[PDB]
C-alpha cells in the first residue's frame, strides 16, 4: 500500500517534526496538495530533531511525507491515531537499509494546534 | 483508567519529546521506574518543542508521563502504536481546561533509537 | 477524558462487534447521534462474540459505546486508528472490576464497508 | 515493509476474528510460529464475520496473517495498538483489487483474554 499519505481536514494548521536515527543523512520532504512546502536534511544516531514546522493543509487537505537518503527513497510505514476523538497523530517510520528498525527518519504530524 | 504509563522493554534507549499548545505554562515530568529523570517546562500556542531527551528504560521498563499546569494535574489520554512489528510510539495528550482539544501538552515517546 | 465517543463520516455504514472476557454479563449499548440503536448482552470468559451489527452513522456521525455490568457503568478506554489512509478502526476496552485487564467487554467499530 | 506479522507474549491465549467486504471470496490463513492453525473463508459485501477463534501464541509468540482470493495474495496493511498499557489489538487490512479500500478482508487479533 501507499504509505506516508494522510488526509487532514481542509485549511487546518498542523505540526510536522522529524527525528533521525541512522548513519545516513536523511532528507524529509513534506508535500501539501502535491507541492513541496518543507524540507529537512540532517543526520543523527541519537534521535536528534532535524526539523519542526507549522504548516497549513490547504484546500485539499492532502499531506504526503517522502524520505530519501543520498537520492534513494526509503521504505515507509505509517498510520494515523486519534485520541479523545480530537487529538490526531499521523506517524511515519522509514528504513534506508536492511536492519528493519524503521527509525532512520521518524516523522510525527500532529493537529489541532493552538 | 490510568493514562500515560507504558511498559518498555528493559534497559532500552528511548526518546521523549513534548510540544505545547495552550495559554498555560506546561510542566511535563518523565518518571522511569518511579524516579523523575526529566522535566520540561514551557508555554506556546504554536506547537513549540518544550523539551526532547534520550533516556534509558532501566530494569523495570516502566515509563510514566505526568503533565501539570499551574500546580494542577492535567487530564491525560494515551496509547501505544507499533508499526512494522518494530517501531514503537507511546503517545500522550493532555487537557488543562474545558475545551477538550487534549493538545495542551503533547508528548511522544519513540523507540528503538540508533 | 470521555472515552468511547467517535466521529464517523456522516451517513456512512459501519460495523460494530463486541467480545466478552469476564465473569459478569456485559451490556453493550451503541448510540448513534445520542440515541441507543443496539444493545448486546452476553457472558463469556473466552472472547465470545456477544453481538455484531451493521449500522448507519446518520447526519451527525456520532457513535458512542457504553458498557455496563448489572447496571453499573464500566470504565472505558478507546482510540481510533486509520490504516492506508482509508481503513478505520474505533476500539473500546472496558473494566468492570479491579484487575485492570480492560478486556471485560471489547468493542470494535470498522468502516468503510463494502 | 512486511505486514501482518506480530510478536505476542509467549504462551498466551488470543482471539482472531475476520470480516469480509468484497465481491471476491476471502481466504484468511493464521500461522502461529510458522504453522497454519486456522483458516477462515467466506464472501460478503456487508462485513460478515467469516471466522472467529481462540488460539495460543506458543513458545515463539509469532502470529502471521495471510490473505488470498482464489489463490492470489492480497496486499496487506497492519499495525498494533495498546490501550491502558494492557489491552492489545493487532489489526490487518487487505486489498484484492484496484480500489484501495483495504477492507476486503479485515482481521482483528486481541489479547489478553479471560
Ligand atoms: C552513509 C550511509 C550509510 C547507509 S546504510 O545503509 O548503512 N544505513 C544506515 C544505518 O545506520 C545504522 C547506524 C542504523 O541506524 C541502521 O538502522 C541504519 O539503517 C546509507 C543508506 S547512507
Ligand atoms: C494562564 C492559563 C490559562 C489557562 S486556561 O484554562 O485558560 N487553559 C488554556 C487554554 O488555552 C487556549 C489558548 C487553548 O489552547 C486551550 O486548548 C487551552 O486549554 C490555564 C490552565 S493557565
Ligand atoms: C459475576 C460477577 C463477577 C464480577 S467481578 O467484579 O468479579 N469482575 C469480573 C472479572 O471476571 C474475571 C474472570 C476477569 O475476566 C476479570 O477481568 C473481570 O473483571 C462482576 C463485576 S459480576
Ligand atoms: C480485478 C479483480 C476483481 C475482483 S472482484 O470482482 O472480486 N471484486 C473485488 C472488489 O469487490 C468490490 C465489491 C469492492 O468490495 C472492492 O473493494 C473489492 O476489491 C478481484 C478479487 S480481482
Ligand atoms: Ca535502519
Ligand atoms: Ca536506525
Ligand atoms: Ca485545552
Ligand atoms: Ca490547546
Ligand atoms: Ca477486568
Ligand atoms: Ca477480564
Ligand atoms: Ca478493495
Ligand atoms: Ca472492499
3-state SS, one letter per residue, for B27-88: EEEEEECCEEEEEEEEEEEEEEEEEEEEEECCCCCEEEEEEEECCEECEEEEEEEEECCCEE
H or E stretch including C38? strand C35-56
- Tell me A101's DSSP state: -
Cis peptide before C112, with omega less than 30 degrees from 0? yes
> Nearest residue CA, atom 6 of ligand 3?
C97
State how far the Cα of C89 lies from the Cα of C52, in Å rounded to an integer: 15
**CB-CB neighbours of B92 under 10 Å:** 28
Query: Grid coordinates in use for B85?
Result: 512489528
Q: Which of D84, D74, D91 is nearest to D22 (CA)?
A: D74
State how far the Cα of C64 lies from the Cα of C2, in Å rounded to an integer: 10
Q: A46, A19 in Cβ contact below 8 A?
A: no
- Judging by beta carbons within 10 Å of its beta carbon (0-12, 13-18, 19+), is residue A71 exposed, middle or buried? exposed
Range of the domain at B90: 1-114
- Judging by beta carbons within 10 Å of its beta carbon (0-12, 13-18, 19+), is residue B89 exposed, middle or buried? buried
H or E stretch including D72? strand D72-73
State how far the Cα of A36 lies from the Cα of A18, in Å rounded to an integer: 16
Q: A74, A105 in Cβ contact below 8 A?
A: yes
State how far the Cα of B73 lies from the Cα of B104, in Å rounded to an integer: 12
Query: Grid coordinates in use for B113?
Result: 533509537
Subunits that touch chain A (at least 3 Cβ pairs < 8 angstroms)?
A: B, C, D
- Residues whose CB falls within 8 Å of the CB of residue A48, separated by 6 or more in sequence, listed in order: A19, A20, A42
Best of B19, B20, B21, B24 to mutate for ligand 2, by most ligand atoms within 8 A of CB?
A: B24
State how far the Cα of C109 lies from the Cα of A3, in Å rounded to an integer: 23
State how far the Cα of B45 lies from the Cα of C38, in Å rounded to an integer: 41
Query: Grid coordinates in use for C79?
Result: 482510540
State how far the Cα of B47 lies from the Cα of B104, in Å rounded to an integer: 9
Q: B78, D87 in Cβ contact below 8 A?
A: no
Q: What angle do CA B104, B77, C61 make, to 5 degrees?
A: 95
Structural biology method used: X-ray
Q: B43, B25 in Cβ contact below 8 A?
A: yes
Query: Grid coordinates in use for B90?
Result: 507511546
Task: Establish whether A99 is an annotated binding residue.
Answer: yes
CATH of the domain at B61: 2.60.120.400
Q: Which of D51, D92, D49, D90 is nearest to D74 (CA)?
A: D92
Q: Which atom of ligand 1 is nearest to the CA of A22?
A: 15
H or E stretch including D108? strand D105-111
Alpha carbon separation from A5 to A87, A104, C35, C83 (Å, rounded) = 18, 18, 35, 10
In a 13 Å sphere around the CA of A97, the CA atoms on its Cβ side amount to: 10
- Tell me D97's DSSP state: S
Q: C26, C50 in Cβ contact below 8 A?
A: yes
Total number of domains in chain C = 1
Strands A87-95 and D13-20: unpaired
State how far the Cα of D64 lies from the Cα of B91, in Å rounded to an integer: 26
Q: C50, C41 in Cβ contact below 8 A?
A: yes
Residue A101: left (phi > 0), alpha (psi -120 to 50), or beta? Answer: alpha
Q: Which of A108, C6, D39 is nearest to B92 (CA)?
A: A108
Q: A71, C72 in Cβ contact below 8 A?
A: no
Q: What angle do CA D19, C69, C32 make, to 5 degrees?
A: 50
Task: Establish whether C95 is an annotated binding residue.
Answer: yes
> Nearest residue CA, atom 16 of ligand 3?
C22
State how far the Cα of C62 lies from the Cα of C4, in Å rounded to an integer: 11
CA of B55 to the centre of ligand 2 (A): 30
Q: A17, B49 in Cβ contact below 8 A?
A: yes
In chain C, residues with a C-beta closer than 8 Å to the C-beta of A2 are 84-85
Q: What are the E-state strand segments in A1-114?
A: 5-7, 13-32, 35-56, 62-69, 72-73, 75-83, 87-95, 105-111
Whose grid coordinates read 512494522? B84
Q: D17, D52 in Cβ contact below 8 A?
A: yes
Q: C89, B79 in Cβ contact below 8 A?
A: no
Would you give the end-to-end CA distance of chain A in angstroms?
33
State how far the Cα of D40 lies from the Cα of D29, in Å rounded to an integer: 7
Q: Is the dihedral of CA C62, C68, C73, C78 positive or negative?
A: negative
Amino acid at each position: 500500500a501507499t504509505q506516508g499519505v494522510f488526509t487532514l481536514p481542509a485549511n487546518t494548521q498542523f505540526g510536522v517534526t522529524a527525528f533521525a536515527n541512522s548513519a545516513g543523512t536523511q532528507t524529509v520532504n513534506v508535500q501539501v496538495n502535491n507541492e513541496t512546502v518543507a524540507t529537512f536534511t540532517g543526520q543523527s544516531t541519537n534521535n536528534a530533531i532535524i526539523g519542526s514546522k507549522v504548516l497549513n493543509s490547504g484546500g485539499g487537505g492532502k499531506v504526503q511525507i517522502l524520505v530519501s537518503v543520498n537520492g534513494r527513497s526509503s521504505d515507509l510505514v505509517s498510520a494515523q491515531v486519534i485520541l479523545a476523538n480530537e487529538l490526531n497523530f499521523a506517524l511515519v517510520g522509514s528504513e534506508d537499509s536492511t536492519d528493519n528498525d524503521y527509525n532512520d527518519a521518524v516523522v510525527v504530524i500532529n493537529w489541532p494546534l493552538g
